[PDB]
Symmetry: D3
Subunit: 255 residues, 6 copies
């Protein structure tokens, strides 16, 4: 990798965007590396949680405009660059975005792709694409709208204005806001805690929530219960309930 | 001795179902769920019952489900059992349903409250899905109803941690309609229930269906369904009376037809 | 001059449609709705009009629908009338639309505002669906749009009670974009409209389409649609200009092509 | 029961409409009894397949017109009589319709509600509702359209014309057409064979097929594989694959 | 109207494409006229059926080639010409296409937009656009696929080959095939019979069938039954069922 | 590769399943190779068509049963083997399956994953999974049901019986049936023809057909017209028009 740095801490995989010189602008090259890194941690049974964060002042301020400026519809159609983003979407391992600073355009879309977001008090979110004559192309218009409704989404998408971490939290986009200096510490504590929950349960609960977003209630509940059944084939379910009935600490193993 | 885990009674045009197993904080067993379903469907069929209220006896609404009866289950037993079929039955009751949450509403308990149309909570009530900490997950619509109500980001946080949510926060999130003092719970609920019982029966019924469609259906198709119910309402005497009273600047007198 | 219920005018790149029956609080009759749609579609097709503004003359935006004309109707008459097909036409207008709610916006009035992309409300504006109290229900998307915006628990309370919502509450719920003093409404709205009219026209257009799909489409398919619009924008002069004007650090000049 | 007669034979449950005096016209009470009978057989783990057929010359020719001739929309709305048909729709046990003669209106919808249809070469299908001033109300317009397309669906729904058993078979509505005196023989044979297949596999395949009708491919496949996973918790899967590998006849048990 | 000719006859509205010199090539202007005419007939409760046909030897040999030569992406986006095609899609009055000859590209799409298709023996269908490096843009890919499946649809759409009236009938696309000189007479006869069917029944059955094409079964049945209820508010339902019981010929009034 | 052989002839990529010793039984490793080969051909803008066929007497006769005979649900859940099949599903390059022999289970599902199927008159299709105590887990229940309807799909899925090439073609599953010895000749001729068509048009048409299968009509058409617009940004669209007005053969370059 030449645009990111990855490391492991316990059962948590950490991915740091490493292009602070350009505020970690997400180039097609960088996105490719990020996906490769996420998929690698996902495949690794030892990594139960993945954390994304930015090196320097920003999380990710937009995408690389330079490599985009002269493109045309046909080149983009053949390129199919958002297929890399779709790969991120189907990763089943829990993912947390630790937004240390500016998260604009592609940067905001990268954060929205994660399951949880812990934001620095100094972080700001937004989609300035409209002011460049374009629009978000990596799910920004879709994920934002499902989270806050069309009335509010259009106001941010049509203006390209900057949203504060505090407002993102009130809107249900961000899970927690913490001081810049405590961001990583808080995020790692959360990740460590999640890595201690039954791995199968997190996995299947994540799938259910994803179906809940799209699926009609009845069919979503249909999918939900099938996952419920599957959990009773796991040792963690037997132990979790046995422990509950025996007033003792449960000992999970991810199987 | 109709039921063994619940107690049902009718007050005016309001049917009331009280979970009756406070010795176990009203833990929802598969048996209890079956009784709740029978009671609700009966109140639904009763032309005299226009609103159904669900509440818990004791200090808890329902604190989880009966773990002992499923602690040793396997996928096969559960597949043939199809226990959630009973929950789907509650889901399709057309009569308005209100949950008066008097305390702990966890796991299956939270799902029962979410199954209702409106939720009046005691400022002392707590909500949550502790299932993950038992090695499993909500299986009666919990992951679906909570996500639709508060979004995936917030939903996953609660579902993955199994942490308890306060009534106040539940209200801020649009999960709970109103929060009141513990001693005033059943009063606020029965008053709200009584007020709804005075609304045009057909209108409440059809508005409920439409809202349910609005959750699943794409806008255009949801609007196509909405208008069909709108047309149907003009075949009722209540529509004639309601609009007349409106034009005649007088209070309408509905009858339910 | 064949517009007896509304008045339309243009200022720069902004088209303004003013409901003109203050004598009856701009009650939405089938005739008035038909006129609104005709004017909006004309403004929509006119590429010189980049933003459309709807507002009411007098104290109200639109205080419900014409009930007298509706009072004696029956299901069959409503079926052949298919009056809501006109509302569907408003739903597909591609030009950005803003509702400047100067006052009461009840029933159809609330549905008219909800049909717009953004809502700027006077602090004196009140919203609501009193239809239930008339023995009916909203029939022009009210139950659908409200539910998608605030969830079923909260939507059902407003729909079942028919209570009035304040402009302040509507803003908190994410229904209204901003609240301003009565005497500043049109100034604020026209200001906003003017600004929007300066944004790259194709971007606003395709972004609006993408957002509409986001409400209905499952995430994966919505994203598939989104990127196709992303591709298309790179065939526009504004995209080349916008990005060039960004790398060169200068003011971009947009033309809508 | 007053309008139907139920009996068991091997692992097959038989429900015979018993009102030939009126060609088994489907009244609301009759549908209610059919549902009760089907759910009972469904619950009875001794019955692995359910067969529906009509006593006399007809399977079911329409519904009870006299019963609803004076109904209004409000009466029908509160009645919610099609909720009984919805109940038939969710029965998980395999169901087969043995159509002996006329299967019109509700009768045709009753056949379409089943999973497979075997019909006498003398049987006829159709929706004459249009000629009574109404339309099919128990899934007829929906199930027919999904099987043969809107162009052909409208042709039959708008005219109310009668379709020959042979035409239905060619359209993919009817699975098999046999001579009148062999209808029950062929149907019971088929029922027996299916009763010998692994019950869980039939059950889960039936759910998947139902989802294939209503789900976009990607999501349908998501549901499909979850059912696939579930079957590996069964003894029938182990035995089924073992027998295949051991080139011997399998002995399934429904678990 | 300089591209089409509209006229009534009985309770049947007739629309004739009138640019035989150019084989009725569908131009934006012509489509605009077709929409105006159809919507006028739709709103008129005196016209119970609408028939579309072409003058000369063809139904419609495609779209206006001049448009295809002048159009560009942005221009097309602003024109939103296919919105007019969407209007045809929601016409509630029964519509019949009498294909008198070539129905290629937009021509095929126009025919597919009708509820039923009566074709001449010499009529041929197809989407040759691919050969010009273009694709159907008026529902062709959508409607063809829903009628014959993706495997078969892709062959026709990818090759651009012509389909015979006979094969179309076999595929359930065309409802009936007749000789060239009996086309109109046979179509007007069918239109006449349909015009005698209960108007409300036809209207609501059409709505239901349209939902069946898209809706999941359960939701479709939900819509279907609401329309069922509504029909019991009409005099035609009471007259139809009463007449059926009284053994008399019903007199429907469309109310 | 150890289970397949990839070859490039002109603008056509050919993948030969090469484990005739086991009738090309599809193991998880083999599927992985197929995906790798297919995606490689897909990315190569010099390969316009991909053909899949089986070495030996069978195309692929089921999956590797030994490999999964003792698997449990948890093992399968973590494995997520069908994610490889989802990758096949999203390949945008045209794909044709040349079915030489038996195409059972995963084999049938592999053929179904292709856009077009040319089969030997001696080939047979089927889903024997049910007879092993399981069910198809790679889209079989989904794709088959969408192609032939729930009545006919269940018949085959519940019985596991083998379907002839002839019937498959009558059902709309198979595009063409030819003499065993002419299988590749025909397939390569079809492949050669498609290779001559406009690459972008085939690509965007394929996407539209895929939407048509799932999407409701109105939304499918909104997607369709967007692709329609994009094609007018291609040089091939101009070349297509030019070649026509000049009455000559067009030379498309995929731009």
């Amino acid at each position: 990798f030449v645009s990111i740095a990855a490391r492991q801490e316990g059962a948590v995989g950490i991915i740091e965007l490493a292009r602070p010189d350009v505020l970690n602008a997400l180039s097609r090259q960088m996105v490719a590396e990020i996906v490769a890194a996420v998929e690698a941690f996902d495949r690794n049974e030892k990594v139960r949680v993945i954390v994304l964060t930015g090196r320097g002042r920003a999380f990710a301020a937009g995408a690389d405009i330079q490599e985009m400026a002269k493109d045309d519809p046909i080149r983009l159609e053949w390129l199919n660059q958002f297929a890399d983003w779709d790969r991120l979407s189907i990763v089943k391992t829990p993912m947390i975005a630790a937004v240390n600073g500016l998260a604009l355009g592609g940067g905001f879309e990268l954060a929205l792709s994660c399951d949880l977001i812990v934001a620095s008090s100094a972080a700001e979110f937004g989609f300035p694409e409209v002011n460049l004559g374009v629009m978000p192309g990596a799910g920004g218009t879709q994920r934002l709208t499902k989270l806050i409704g069309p009335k509010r989404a259009l106001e941010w998408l049509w203006t390209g204005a900057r949203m504060s971490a505090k407002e993102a939290e009130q809107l249900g986009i961000v899970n927690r806001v913490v001081s810049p200096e405590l961001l990583m510490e808080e995020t790692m504590r959360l990740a460590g805690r999640l890595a201690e929950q039954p791995p199968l349960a997190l996995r299947l609960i994540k799938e259910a929530v994803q179906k809940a977003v799209d699926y009609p209630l009845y069919e979503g509940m249909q999918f939900e219960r099938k996952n419920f059944y599957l959990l009773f084939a796991s040792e963690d379910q037997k132990e979790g309930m046995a422990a509950f009935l025996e007033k003792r600490k449960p000992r999970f193993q991810g199987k």
